[PDB]
Amino acid sequence: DHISIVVSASGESDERKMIDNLMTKLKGFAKSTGVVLVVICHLKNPDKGKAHEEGRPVSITDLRGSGALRQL
Amino acid sequence: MTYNVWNFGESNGRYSALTARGISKETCQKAGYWIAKVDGVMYQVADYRDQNGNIVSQKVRDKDKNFKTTGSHKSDALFGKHLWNGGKKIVVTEGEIDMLTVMELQDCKYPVVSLGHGASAAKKTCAANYEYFDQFEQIILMFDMDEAGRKAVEEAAQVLPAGKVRVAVLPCKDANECHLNGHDREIMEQVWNAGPWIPDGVVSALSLRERIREHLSSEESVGLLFSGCTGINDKTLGARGGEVIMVTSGSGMVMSTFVRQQALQWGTAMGKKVGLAMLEESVEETAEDLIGLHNRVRLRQSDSLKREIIENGKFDQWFDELFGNDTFHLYDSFETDRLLAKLAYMRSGLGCDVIILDHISIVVSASGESDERKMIDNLMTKLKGFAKSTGVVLVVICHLKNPDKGKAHEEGRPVSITDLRGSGALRQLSDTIIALERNQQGDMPNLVLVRILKCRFTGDTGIAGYMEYNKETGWLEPSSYSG
Amino acid sequence: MTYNVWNFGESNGRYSALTARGISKETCQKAGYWIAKVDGVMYQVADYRDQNGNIVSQKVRDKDKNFKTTGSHKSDALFGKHLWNGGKKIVVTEGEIDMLTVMELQDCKYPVVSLGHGASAAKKTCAANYEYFDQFEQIILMFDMDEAGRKAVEEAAQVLPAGKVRVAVLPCKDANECHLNGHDREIMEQVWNAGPWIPDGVVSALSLRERIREHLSSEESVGLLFSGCTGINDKTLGARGGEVIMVTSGSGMVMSTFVRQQALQWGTAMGKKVGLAMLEESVEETAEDLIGLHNRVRLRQSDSLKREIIENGKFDQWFDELFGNDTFHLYDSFETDRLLAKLAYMRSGLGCDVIILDHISIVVSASGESDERKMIDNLMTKLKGFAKSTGVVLVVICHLKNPDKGKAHEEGRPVSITDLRGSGALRQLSDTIIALERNQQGDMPNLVLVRILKCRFTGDTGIAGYMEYNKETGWLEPSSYSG
């Protein structure tokens, strides 16, 4: 519950990048060991008109990260 | 060059039984524990060989509890190692004698090796041997049953392969103390089927029953009630420990009063110890603002009264009155990491249950870094961590960016979470968001509105009530009002 | 191998009383301070055992001040540690002898341990033992009363658990120097009830009484009243020393008058010595502007009058009249550091209590550096420093960037702190912000508004009154005005 929290090893830039690094280790863990890994993850916030509580549907573009999750 | 490996025979070697330890003669013979005697005195020699069979080093003993190490004792030395290459299960003991022990009890038929530098070098010796150990299905750490011995296990398993390590648990200091009249059978029950671990943070649910029960009674639904506007309470059900309350609003000093007020009633009405990091102002200043607020008088804001109470003794009186219950404590200033640390000791050391952090906008000290946009978030988290990790109540004040859209902040303009500063961390990490609006050029220039902008614990949000500034006493009084 | 642990008896051991230190024989016996004698010479042996009881290491002494350390002296060694597992309070002394001391004075009934490598390894030895020490309610650091000894305390408490640490304060170097004829009762008054600390910036409120009461008398309420608009005063309560008042506004010469006016009444009505750094103009010019202003006549702005008062003696008269109280002093020009230095000597040397610095916008001299955005801030701070550090009142004039949004400055357009120049330093470091607006093409082209844009000391802000320009006398007159 809730990938957005990375946490501990501080001297490093974009959560953009790091989110991805963890993402893979996870998918590895997953496939490597056959466990089912549900991973919760929260949404960045539009800038476009209708918010989240206004229902606005979400796409994979609508996705957070920078591709790892949108993939892995 | 290095100390020559001791030749058997050259030094008057015998494979004799260690009668003092209940290790048989036949046993010492198989692991390579021989008894030499050079230049007069009789030494105990342990032969360390590599997986290939040769002897690469020796650990020699004399009676009195000395040593002498021959050959080249590499960082990966395991005594016994050469005997086993593969298997379903390998016990790994602290020292050579304990290896000799398990090797008995088992009629030397299964694998045991001992740590090369054992004790302290558990981590290094082990990781040096990942491959060797992975040759076996499960690795049973049978180390010392003491302070540094449990530690050894810990550091060991950390570097050892996957789900294979299991901790041995004996009745006595070591596996030999057991054998030496006691409980052979106890050692046995562990070699077959030891506990399985190092989970130092994994915690099955079953094993929480008690911790839960005592939680349920201890911590409270109606945590700490906001004061000056039932409403704040009605909607948020209070400031529960480990939460992160976030007070925000426009120009609001209204804001800095509201927090102050809460600080006040929590540290007096309620029993709670408040800790204050009012980064804006001095520590003396805030204390005055408290005292005056407590006595419903605008204390700093008045030459005359200051003088008056200094002289008429009322100061020392009021001061005792409010403070003399060691319940208020302030961070006094002139980094991010540096601050957080201070705040923590407030929580941990003086054990206050609220920490009010006035005005997150001030990051401060470690300068070579870009957007306060980003950094505001970084701190945000350390904070929420501090919070949940320690169950302290963390109120955090925070000021608003300024529209660009038509009506300003003193024009009342309501605030949304979009209206929010930061770039997401607060807009997220905060548990309750209380905002206060004040149209200081209007119908009630002293009327201030309270939006609950968010409240995890309830999710009941919205307009929550009104207060009115008493320019005279300095308080945010509660007010009548609605549609 | 490592130096074998010294066997009692093997070395001719006796538990004898240390007559040189006032440690009884019975005492040395309990902590494990025994007196051996090997190969001829008589050594003092300290027995370090782990919590389990077993002797893990020895620290041996000979007469002349040497050592010899037996066994394995781990980074967590505490001499006496094995004696206590829990308790309400544990004294922790620098060395073994001092442990023996507290162990006396108390008839060995309470806990004392000594640092394993004491002196310098205070941080390491301590944090190695967090758990062990947390077994007790309060940890009393009774270290050396010297340079490195106070430091030891500091590094120690840093790594030690929460709000448990309290520093011992003895009359002499150590707890034994006390015992050795002096003040046993001094050591006692510390073991019980010794004062707590080790937070270097956290400060319980209770512990501020005094600092507060001297504050309240010392610092002051109605400091120096703005002239020409009670309002400015009403809202700001004046220009208190060490503050940094910041006057701003559009094209405002209005601004440069307002400041001038203030300078005027402060240095004449009030006793105060004004120092002026009018960077825009010459020193002679500003002096004329003052004289004229004081005599309600537009002096420089008039060929005829100049001549007139030069001849009719009125100049020399007016000049004496205004100036001859050595109360005005000006920085006269043709760097940032260089300026700040001059300003300081005004404060420190001639001891003026107000410095008016007309027009921050002018940084000047040290050219190889980017944004005035950034640099404006750098100066800003040195200034606020200067201010608070020396208690001088620093008024600082500052001009406004120009909108890009519709109505200009001479179109009256109000100003906000966003509306602010700089990039945050002034928007911050300044204590009161007075702004003056003037819609010089309108209904009252001579009417000027005063916003208080900010005021730490009171936080009462906003529209604060009006004045009117007398194009004729040159003054900012106070005016009737509202809704």
From Swiss-Prot, chain A:
<comment type="similarity">
    <text>Belongs to the Teseptimavirus DNA helicase/primase family.</text>
</comment>
<feature type="site" description="dTTP/dATP binding">
    <location>
        <position position="42"/>
    </location>
</feature>
<comment type="function">
    <text>ATP-dependent DNA helicase and primase essential for viral DNA replication and recombination. The helicase moves 5' -&gt; 3' on the lagging strand template, unwinding the DNA duplex ahead of the leading strand polymerase at the replication fork and generating ssDNA for both leading and lagging strand synthesis. ATP or dTTP hydrolysis propels each helicase domain to translocate 2 nt per step sequentially along DNA. Mediates strand transfer when a joint molecule is available and participates in recombinational DNA repair through its role in strand exchange.</text>
</comment>
<comment type="subunit">
    <text>Homohexamer. Assembles as a hexamer onto linear or circular ssDNA in the presence of ATP or dTTP. Present in a mixture of heptamers and hexamers in the absence of DNA. Interacts (via C-terminus) with the viral DNA polymerase that is bound to DNA; this interaction is essential to initiate leading-strand DNA synthesis. The priming complex consists of 2 DNA polymerases and 1 helicase-primase hexamer that assemble on the DNA template. Interacts with the single-stranded DNA-binding protein.</text>
</comment>
<protein>
    <recommendedName>
        <fullName>DNA helicase/primase</fullName>
    </recommendedName>
</protein>
